[PDB]
Amino acid sequence: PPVKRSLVYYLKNREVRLQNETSYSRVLHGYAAQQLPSLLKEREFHLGTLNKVFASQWLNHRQVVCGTKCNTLFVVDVQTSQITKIPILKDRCGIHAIELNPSRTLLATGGDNPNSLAIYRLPTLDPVCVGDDGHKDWIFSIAWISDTMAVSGSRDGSMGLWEVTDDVLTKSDARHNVSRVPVYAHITHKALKDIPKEDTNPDNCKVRALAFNNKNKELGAVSLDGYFHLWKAENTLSKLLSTKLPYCRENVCLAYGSEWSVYAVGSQAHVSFLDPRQPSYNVKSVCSRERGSGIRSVSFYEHIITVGTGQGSLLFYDIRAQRFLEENLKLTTGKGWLNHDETWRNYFSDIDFFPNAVYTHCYDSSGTKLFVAGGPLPSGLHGNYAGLWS
């Protein structure tokens, strides 16, 4: 017996209220995921003179926070383009990673000290706690394994595990009631564990991406020498396995698709699809064709993967069709802004535009609004880009 899957059944049944419920959920949102990329138009934001928006997420359907290579943190109201800056959390450089706990009660970011983790309350972005000392080097990644516990990776290859217990929250609240100036709660790593070091370059131990599989309570992790490390995260951080990525350079982004049990991983050219339990041959990869520029962020909306590239193009890949959506359909980031200091003067003397690399992008809670941000691809350049697409 075949499945009742046509949207016209759903529409007529809905006209009849004949159980037009979740049985059609995957059909409704899946259809949208294929259609939406062709309907999007760019709306750039006037951010001013900021360096590069390196991280961003939807706090709410209308609100996106942006974390910068230059340690300022702020909100873009995507509707009005209004800016509002947020406190930058210090210890007891830039905001290269940002994360939300699954309850959407806590925000996690890199701190003032690039080595230290920062926590804020959702939705107010009240500060919660001080920066730690678990990493001896910069915090390169974050992932929420419960609503009290988050794991953070680092450029030294260590992985700090943290718990914001109720005591941390109540201490922050009590302190904020006694003192008019915000005074933070104190935190320390519940565990500090290093990655297995493989046959690749021993100075390049950098752990640049993390993603939490809520179903198996597994934590995925990716290094820039090209290795994935898998950890159990039920109540504590525990190694399960480690394995090489099929593209072994510039793996700066990782996302986990709970509807497909698979992690999507970036690189200098390809998006790779991993179930970490499977052998290396069961790891299929699609090339962005924006070759030389790197994939710079990645995300899932039903069976469609959104790929932000170093050439500033956003590509959309269909798992089921095993191809990009349509002559691939791609948005491309506008000029944004660019500073003309001595560094540009020395090395980029005649370039007035950069194909603004998509350092961060995310879908709103409906998926109809795709926030996008970035800047120039090379390392010496200073020049933000941001724009909503809708």
Partner: protein, 1140 residues
């Protein structure tokens, strides 16, 4: 900023849940019926169901349960809404007043968690120790029934079984014990826990059974002495009790899914079961007495009782009667029999209850072409599908019709002195009189002795002393009932002809030029007591008796030809008591004295169709409280009639109207008749409580419906109507519809039963060559429940299915419009369709078809095959605009009477809805809300003016005016988005501003321009502009309209005040209820006014009105805002009632 009002014209009707218990008392068996936002409480009597109380909640209802905490004399009622507002309710009554008191309440929504994959579930423990809720997957929410838990605080027990299909609490267990079906990778299982309110966790239950039937749901907890539980699937029924297991799998139930059940016997010996069709079964649990004396289950056994309404829910009642709650058709009361009838049926229908839901389409029409507007809706589904001809005004049930033209009057007579009922009807004509004898239902023309046949009758009727009276131009004639003999005759002293007359049981008054004569009716004698001469010729006169008087009127009411005045004269003196100037230039044509609600009124109607009415003081003849309503354009004749023993007045005109009093004010309701010149009451053996109606060419005899405002002439199709439109040129309705036929061993399909398309006076099947290009040969699998669609052409006067065109196999006919196109004069039926197949999410195939109905024949004028489903079509500048999946397409009407491509618009996910005005096009997307286009005649293309970038799951759209666009979405919210002409940049201009947001609570199926209330042309003080009617899946009909700014800035303030003053059942805040609500966001109501709430302003006492009124700013038309009064708001709300 934007200014809009939304109101319910008709309440929801479709039953979404029902239960029986002992809510109003222990001894009342109640049936409780939930309809989507409406709770209804019925008492089970031997005679039938009696409605006792109805409540509208500020909340769609999702769970309903009755339970009895220990020590309570009667049940408590648990209700959970779709917004997760929970409450515990108790029926209270004080004298006639009834209130539903909330003992406990609280929102139980969790801030994060996916709402459960199989509706919302709530159940109550037999000993009422706790309530269990399944709101979210993986979480079982427990509410202790501690009396101190008055706030419905709850805790979640983490449930490792994520997907829960059904739940119950078991009987006879010392610990409250949950029993539930859940689904896992292993299939479905039944499992139990002893729920510890102390440990707030699942201790192990008394038993478990893995691997029940994969389709299993519908858990029945089985009471003492049996204990245990029954599990009901698609194919089998299984009983479990500790170690004991029993199962049966009747082939008779395998034909359909059981979807509800009810406990017949308190000890669980018998259970009703109801399938998708409304086949109703009895499930027997046969007892075995064991050797220790205990009672156990011996075997299960299922009997088919017969057929009933499609069951959403079932209820065994009392005396062998059963109620069937129907969502898709009329709900039913049926009696079960011990012995079957000749058909083998044990089920006999006892009563039936009307249901409009789901209203899947509608259109506004003038079949009498008067311009009032009537609404014909697609209603019900499957074997219950039915057209509902809805209309502001009272219907007439025609029992007989006679082709007697030129009738100038109507009166009943009782020729037989032994009969209390009428046996004769009298018709007047110019220069002659005719009489119709009544013999049961049979009507035959006869000669009534004592009456004059060669003269026009101006009045006749039964009179005192067992006599009949006739009044003619030459004389007043008194005739005995037996032997129909003339006993007395009176003539005018100057032999001048009587021109009008009125008479009661003891008095006669006649108009002769300017003179009036008053006679008394004595046994076999007419006595002239008095006479008078009026200043002007008499245009009309009346002496209808009032109050408890024994047919003796102290008053005579008259109207005159020259001064256009109404006058009250004292009888017998003819002394002038009161003179009232009606004004205008047209004479009064009828005057009448009557009683409503034991209050006395004078009515006088002008030849221009204007009606004046007054309070009438009998003792003084004085008139008060003068009011004016225009009923027609032609001369109006006023007559009294009786209905349900009440006294009412009928205004015979080109726009026939019934006049009755409510709350001491006269209410005017149209009558659904083409025209009436004269009428009279008739209470005969064949036509009891009936009216006789005469127009220019015919006499109609029938019974008036209840004096409701909205009538519904139901037409059963026995198949689901889908869309409807009207063709004035052919006086026909086009109706899309769809019956079910199972693809059985016929190889094709076999109908469940005959329906309109099979029953039609003629039929056809789509003969098109477009869709020939591929089939697989082996497609047609056995048992498939195919929906076969048809276009029904329906005569507007008889609602005969004149024609029925069957669409292609699997071709859902999706949209239907009737309009003119191009410069071609014809009106055409135009249908948009889709081929629907199980697997394809979006339709890739469809067509647009143009038909004309002429000379009895539906004919196909044109076709165009399309790349998508044609979800909607509208007329646009004589070109046709049609939306097809993700695109909107504009077809020019060729002079060759066929559509041709002018242009296209894209930039959509799926353009489900289309509406147009001028050069502007409003489009509704499946998720991207609304966008506005402009047509460019100089370019041959569309320019997208602006769009809403907010997400909305559109259910319907409409254009209220040039700048304001109305939308509805699947989360039951409305919104208005508006074009900002003050925008300064292109980016601002491209963005439609959200300027109204509103949670309606009903899923809206259709918006349509039109009004069912006749327009008072020349009266432009109406607070509202435009008129968009809409229908819903629950049978609710509403209306949306624009406002001025000062109307809306008055009215949303009025709404927020009412939100706080009126207390909802379950204590849900109205602002929260109406707050725009989706999974993703909540926003306060703006841009809309809640017309239901605004009309609830008339459902509250003045003290509450005063609370709302105080300090509200009202623009009274002077342009100066002032503090409103309650009477001002009442007038405004009354105006707002009259728009629908």
């Amino acid at each position: 900023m934007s200014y809009n009002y939304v109101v319910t014209a008709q309440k929801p009707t479709a039953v979404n849940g029902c239960v029986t218990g002992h809510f109003t008392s222990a001894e009342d068996l109640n049936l409780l019926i939930a309809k989507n936002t409406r709770l209804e409480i019925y008492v089970v009597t031997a005679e039938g169901l009696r409605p006792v109380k109805e409540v509208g909640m500020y909340g769609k209802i999702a769970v309903m349960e009755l339970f009895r905490p220990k020590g309570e004399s009667k049940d408590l009622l648990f209700i959970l809404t779709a917004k997760y507002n929970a409450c515990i309710l108790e029926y209270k009554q004080s004298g006639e007043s009834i209130d539903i008191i909330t003992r406990a309440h609280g929102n139980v929504q969790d801030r994060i968690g996916r709402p459960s994959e199989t509706g919302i579930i709530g159940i109550i423990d037999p000993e009422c120790r706790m309530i269990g809720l399944r709101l979210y997957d993986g979480l079982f929410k427990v509410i202790p029934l501690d009396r101190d838990n008055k706030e419905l605080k709850a805790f979640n027990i983490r449930l490792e079984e994520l997907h829960v299909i059904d739940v119950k609490f078991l009987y006879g267990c010392q610990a409250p014990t949950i029993c539930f079906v859940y689904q896992d990778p292993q299939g479905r299982h039944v499992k139990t826990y002893e729920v510890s309110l102390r440990e707030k966790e699942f201790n192990k239950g008394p038993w478990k059974q893995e691997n029940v039937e994969a389709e299993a749901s519908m858990v029945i907890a089985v009471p003492e002495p049996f204990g245990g539980a029954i599990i009901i699937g698609q194919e089998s029924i299984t009983y479990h009790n500790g170690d004991k297991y029993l199962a049966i799998a009747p082939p008779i139930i395998k034909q359909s899914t059981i979807v509800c059940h009810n406990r017949v016997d308190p000890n669980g010996s018998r259970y009703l079961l109801g399938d998708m069709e409304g086949r109703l079964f009895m499930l027997l649990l046969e007892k075995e007495e064991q050797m220790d004396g205990t009672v156990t289950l011996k075997d299960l056994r299922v009997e088919l009782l017969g057929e009933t309404s499609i069951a959403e829910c079932l209820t065994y009642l009392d005396n062998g009667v059963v109620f069937v709650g129907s969502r898709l058709g009329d709900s039913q009361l049926v009696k079960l029999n011990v012995d079957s009838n000749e058909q083998g049926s044990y089920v006999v229908a006892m009563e039936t209850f009307t249901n409009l839901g789901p209203i899947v389409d509608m259109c506004v029409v003038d079949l009498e072409r008067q311009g009032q507007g009537q609404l014909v809706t697609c209603s019900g589904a499957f074997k219950e599908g039915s057209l509902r001809i809805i209309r502001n005004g009272i219907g007439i049930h025609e029992h007989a019709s006679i082709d007697l033209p030129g009738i100038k009057g109507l009166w009943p007579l009782r020729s037989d002195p032994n009969r209390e009922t009428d046996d004769t009807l009298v018709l007047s004509f110019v220069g002659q009189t005719r009489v119709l004898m009544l013999n049961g239902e049979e009507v035959e023309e006869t000669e009534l002795m004592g009456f004059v046949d060669d003269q026009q009758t101006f009045f006749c009727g039964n009179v005192a002393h067992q006599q009949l009276i006739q009044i003619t131009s030459a004389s007043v004639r008194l005739v005995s009932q037996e032997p129909k003999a003339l006993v007395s005759e009176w003539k005018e002293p100057q032999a001048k002809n009587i021109s009008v007359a009125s008479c009661n049981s003891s008095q006669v008054v006649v108009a002769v030029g300017r003179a009036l004569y008053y006679l008394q009716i004595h046994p076999q004698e007419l006595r002239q007591i008095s006479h008078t001469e009026m200043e002007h010729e008499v245009a009309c006169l009346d002496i209808t008796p009032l109050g408890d008087s024994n047919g003796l009127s102290p008053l005579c009411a008259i109207g005159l030809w020259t001064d256009i005045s109404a006058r009250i004269l004292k009888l017998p003196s003819f002394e002038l008591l009161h003179k009232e100037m009606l004004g205008g230039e047209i004479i009064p044509r009828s005057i009448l004295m009557t009683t409503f609600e034991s209050s006395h009124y004078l009515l006088c109607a002008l030849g221009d169709g204007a009606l004046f009415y007054f309070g009438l003081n009998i003792e003084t003849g004085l008139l008060s409280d003068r009011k004016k309503v225009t009923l027609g354009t032609q001369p109006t004749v006023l007559r009294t009639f009786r209905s349900l023993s009440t006294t009412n007045v009928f205004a015979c005109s080109d726009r026939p109207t019934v006049i009755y009093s409510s709350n001491h004010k006269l209410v005017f309701s149209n009558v659904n008749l083409k025209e009436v010149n004269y009428m009279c009451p008739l209470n005969s053996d064949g036509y009891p409580d009936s009216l006789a109606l005469a127009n220019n060419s015919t006499l109609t005899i029938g019974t008036i419906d209840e004096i409701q405002k909205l009538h519904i002439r139901t037409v059963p199709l026995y198949e689901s109507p889908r869309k409807i439109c009207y063709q004035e040129v052919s006086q026909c309705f086009g109706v899309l519809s769809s019956r079910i036929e199972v693809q059985d061993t016929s190889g094709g399909t076999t109908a469940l039963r005959p329906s309109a398309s099979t029953q039609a006076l003629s039929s056809s099947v789509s003969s098109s060559k477009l869709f020939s290009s591929s089939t697989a040969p082996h497609e047609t699998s056995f048992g498939e429940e195919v929906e076969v669609h048809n276009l029904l052409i329906i005569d507007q006067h008889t609602f005969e299915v004149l024609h029925a065109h069957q669409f292609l196999q699997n071709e859902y006919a999706l949209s239907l419009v009737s309009c003119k196109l191009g410069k071609d004069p014809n009106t055409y039926f135009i249908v948009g369709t889709a081929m629907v197949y199980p697997e394809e999410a979006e339709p890739k195939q469809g067509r647009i078809v143009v038909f004309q109905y002429s000379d009895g024949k539906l004919q196909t004028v044109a076709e165009k095959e399309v790349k998508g489903a044609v979800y909607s079509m509208v007329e646009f500048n004589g070109k046709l605009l049609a939306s097809i999946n993700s695109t909107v397409r504009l077809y020019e009407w060729t002079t060759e009477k066929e559509l041709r491509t002018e242009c296209n618009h894209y930039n959509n996910i799926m353009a489900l809805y289309l509406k147009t005005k001028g050069d502007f096009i409003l489009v509704g997307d499946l998720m991207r809300s609304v966008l506005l286009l402009a047509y460019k005649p100089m370019e041959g293309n569309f320019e997208e003016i602006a769009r809403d970038f907010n997400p909305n799951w559109m259910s319907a759209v409409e254009i209220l005016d040039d700048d304001n666009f109305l939308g509805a979405e699947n989360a039951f919210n409305l919104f208005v988005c508006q074009k900002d002409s003050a925008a300064t940049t292109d980016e601002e201009r491209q963005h439609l501003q959200e300027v109204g947001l509103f949670h309606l609570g009903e899923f809206v199926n259709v918006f349509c321009h039109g009004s069912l209330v006749m327009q008072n042309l020349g009266e432009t003080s109406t607070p509202t502009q435009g008129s968009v009617l809409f229908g819903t899946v629950n049978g609710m009909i509403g209306l949306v309209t624009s406002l001025s700014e000062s109307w809306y800035n008055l009215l949303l303030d009025m709404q927020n005040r009412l939100n706080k003053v009126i207390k909802s059942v379950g204590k849900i805040e109205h602002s929260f209820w109406r707050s725009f609500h989706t999974e993703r966001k909540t926003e306060p109501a703006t841009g809309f006014i809640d017309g239901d709430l605004i009309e609830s302003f008339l459902d509250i006492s003045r003290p509450k009105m005063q609370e709302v009124v105080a300090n509200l700013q009202y623009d009274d038309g002077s342009g100066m805002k002032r503090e409103a009064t309650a009477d001002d708001l009442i007038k405004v709300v009354e105006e707002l009632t009259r728009i629908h």
